C-alpha cells in the first residue's frame, strides 16, 4: 500500500549495499509517509534520530544528543573526552551493535561536529575503526533548504572553521571515505504551475540583482494584507503571536482555553503546539495532524465555529466545512534494547495531549516549513539577512502572483552560501564526493 513515486525510491534505496544516501524533497506531508514506511519496514535493524527535539518528535524518534549522550556543546573531532562509548555490557552498547540502518532525519539542522561524533561513536562502539560507521547503513533525510545550523561565535567557531571549514553536515570528512548516494524527489507537486518561479528563486539564490530587481517591481506592497485568504510570515516566533493575539480578541464571540496534560517527560522546549490554547468562535486555525479517518490533513487551514471542553468544529477552506477535531496524545519517545528478540524495540517516555490547531492568521516560517500555502504576506524587521530566510519563505508558495511583502529585500537577504551552491549543483548527479 505504497504511493506511486515513493515506493521507487524507497526500493532504490533499500537494495544496494551501499550505506550512505540522502533523499531530498519538499517535506512535510507526502515526504513523511515515505519515512513511516522506511521505519516500519526496518523494525528489525533501524533507528531513527534527529538533531532537534522538535524534529524528533515529528519522525517519531529521539535526539542524537540523547540517544548517544553527546554533550550540549562543541563535539571536537574524533575526540575521546567528547565522545566516550558506553561501558561493557551496557544497554546502548546492545543497541549500537543490533542497529543497522539509522535513519536521520532533518539533516540540514545537522551540524557537522554532530555528524563526526556520530561517526566516531559508531566506530568505537562497534570496534570496526577502518570502515565509516561500522558499516552501519545511514540514511539521510533533509532537503538543501532548511540550512544552516548555529555557530555561536569565538574560538568555537574558530574551530569549525579550523577543522571542517564551514558548519554544514556534507563538510564532515566521512564523504572522503564513502560516496553519498543521492535520491531527489521534488516531485510533491513541485514545480510546474510556474517554472518561471522557480527560475526567479534560482536566480536570485545565485545573487543576480536585477532579478531583485524584477521581484521588487512586482511584489512590494504596503504593510497589512487586506485581501481574504492572506497568511502573515514572520521570521521569529515572538513577533508573530502578538499579530495572532490582536486579531484573536477582536473577536465577537466567546473564547475557551484548551488543556494539555501530559503523562511522562515532555520538555516544554519540545512542545508541538501551544499549552494554553485559547480560540473563539470564527478564528482562523491549521490543522496539525493527519485525520485517521481520512477526512483531513496536516496543514490546511480554516476556521472554528463551535467550541466545546472536548471538541470544536472547523470548516476548511480547501473543500468546505467537513470536520470535527480529535485532541491526540503523542510521542515522546527514547530507544531502549530488550529482549524481545536481541533486537530494536522502542519505548515511550512522555505524551502531549491537546487538540490540534495552532493560531494561523500569522504563523512563523519554521512552522511553516513543510507546507504549500494560497497566498502569503511577508512581514519584515528590516534585515537579519545573513544567508537569510529569504528563500524558504518565499519558496512557500507556487507562483509569484499572491505574494505581498514589506521592505523591498536588499540583495545581500537573498544569497545562499556558496559552500551550498557547490554542493547543491554535485548532487545533481546522483552521487558525492567531497573534493580532496
Known sequence: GLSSEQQRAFLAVTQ??????????????????????????????????????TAALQARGQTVHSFFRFPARLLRYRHPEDIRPPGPHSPLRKAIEQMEVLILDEVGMVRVDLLEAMDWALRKTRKRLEEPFGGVKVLLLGDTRQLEPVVPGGEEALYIARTWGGPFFFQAHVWEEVALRVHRLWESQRQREDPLFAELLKRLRQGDPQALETLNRAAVRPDGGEEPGTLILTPRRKEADALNLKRLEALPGKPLEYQAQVKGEFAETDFPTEAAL?????????????????????????????????????????????????????????YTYDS?????????????????????????????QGLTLDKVHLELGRGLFAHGQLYVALTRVRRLQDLSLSRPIAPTELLWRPEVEVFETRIQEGIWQKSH
Open 340 to 368: 524481545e528478540r536481541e533486537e530494536i524495540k522502542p519505548q515511550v517516555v512522555g505524551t502531549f495531549r491537546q487538540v490540534p490547531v495552532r493560531l494561523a492568521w500569522a504563523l512563523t516560517v519554521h512552522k511553516a
Open 278 to 334: 485559547t480560540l473563539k468562535k470564527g478564528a482562523q486555525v491549521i490543522l496539525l495532524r493527519n485525520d485517521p479517518l481520512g477526512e483531513y490533513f496536516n496543514g490546511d487551514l480554516g476556521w472554528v465555529e463551535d467550541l466545546e471542553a472536548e471538541a470544536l468544529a472547523v470548516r476548511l477552506k480547501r473543500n468546505g466545512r467537513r470536520v470535527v477535531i480529535r485532541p491526540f496524545v503523542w510521542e515522546k519517545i527514547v
Open 16 to 53: 544496494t549495499p551501499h550505506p550512505a544516501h540522502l533523499i531530498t524533497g519538499p517535506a512535510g506531508t507526502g515526504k513523511t509517509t515515505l519515512l513511516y514506511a522506511l521505519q516500519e519496514f526496518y523494525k528489525g535493524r533501524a533507528v531513527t534520530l534527529a538533531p532537534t527535539g
